[PDB]
Amino acid sequence: ESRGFVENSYLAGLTPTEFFFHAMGGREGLIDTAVKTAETGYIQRRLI
Amino acid sequence: AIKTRIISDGLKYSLATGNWGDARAGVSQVLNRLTFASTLSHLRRLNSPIGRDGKL
Amino acid sequence: DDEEETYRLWKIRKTIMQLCHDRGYLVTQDELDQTLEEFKAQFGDKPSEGRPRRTDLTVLVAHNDDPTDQMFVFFPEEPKVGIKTIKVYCQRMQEENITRALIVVQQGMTPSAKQSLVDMAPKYILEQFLQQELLINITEHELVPEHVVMTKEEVTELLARYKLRENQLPRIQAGDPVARYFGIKRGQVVKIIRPSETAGRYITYRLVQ
DNA sequence: TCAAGCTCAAGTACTTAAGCCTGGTCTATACTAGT
DNA sequence: ACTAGTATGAAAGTACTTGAGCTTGA
């Protein structure tokens, strides 16, 4: 529980430390999605 | 001797435009008045000075 | 070490025999793949100031047809070869009537001698190879497909069938290690047979530039 | 033994960083003749 | 004075050039 394992489910809901660690993982996913776009488009442009 | 435009027009320019100088930009934004939630969320907003489009 | 040196000299000997056979020369069948122990018996198991020293195993081979031309292979004693060392080999070649030769350098050539090798190219052709190039026959590697040098008649047949010019073929470097292996000059089309997972076999062609 | 030439390595400088679209706000200042 | 016109931290990589060192020749 200290290091980010969430033992609750979305039906029960998360405790605030698990909420914040879950928000960290989600922020990592959104950072991936927002940074991926320009580099992939530039690779497509160079290839074409 | 004391001309008033250099001390008032400069404040008015840096608040009206947001170009923070005569440097960086986007410091004074126009307030977002679509929702009272948007108005509150625009008054409680922090900007990291790190520039955009960074791969890190 | 001394066993490591006779192993290294035997592998260079093996790769030069396979290089001469793939280039189209008279290579004797037992010489083309001899045992390390056979090399140690024939030459003497002590490269450290002994019987299988350099210049003992300078391999002279002729061509499989037109047996006049030969590229009697050179092995310098010194690591770093120079001009006053290769002019002795030039003396040994001008004593003969044959124009191709291969030297197997240990360390890198002095670049003045690199320019010097080009400075007799219409007269008599000299290729050079480092020790690390000849500890592995790179044509045996699985990434390297079957390169075959084409005759000039087959090049005319190729360009006349596909109605294209030598400017239009996909090309290959002259300092390409497989091109250096076959010793092809500029303007000499190389057919390349490789297995394709969508047609079975694919023959491409590489003119040399 | 010295000088010259050639090659290699290191340092510095130059070019690019998604696609389309919708809104808004704002646009010089200092001076010096020239009355 | 004064007024309007006039005048000016948290890029990365590749390629080219310069300098230094080593080898050869005289």
Coordinates of C-alpha atoms in Angstrom, one line a residue, chain A residues 1-6 16-26:
Chain A
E1 CA 0.0 0.0 0.0
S2 CA 2.9 2.3 0.6
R3 CA 4.4 1.8 -2.9
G4 CA 1.3 2.0 -5.0
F5 CA -0.5 -1.3 -5.1
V6 CA -4.2 -0.7 -5.1
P16 CA -7.0 8.7 -1.0
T17 CA -3.4 7.4 -1.1
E18 CA -4.6 4.8 -3.7
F19 CA -6.5 7.6 -5.5
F20 CA -3.3 9.7 -5.7
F21 CA -1.2 6.7 -6.9
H22 CA -3.8 5.9 -9.5
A23 CA -3.8 9.5 -10.6
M24 CA 0.0 9.2 -11.1
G25 CA -0.4 6.1 -13.3
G26 CA -3.1 7.9 -15.3

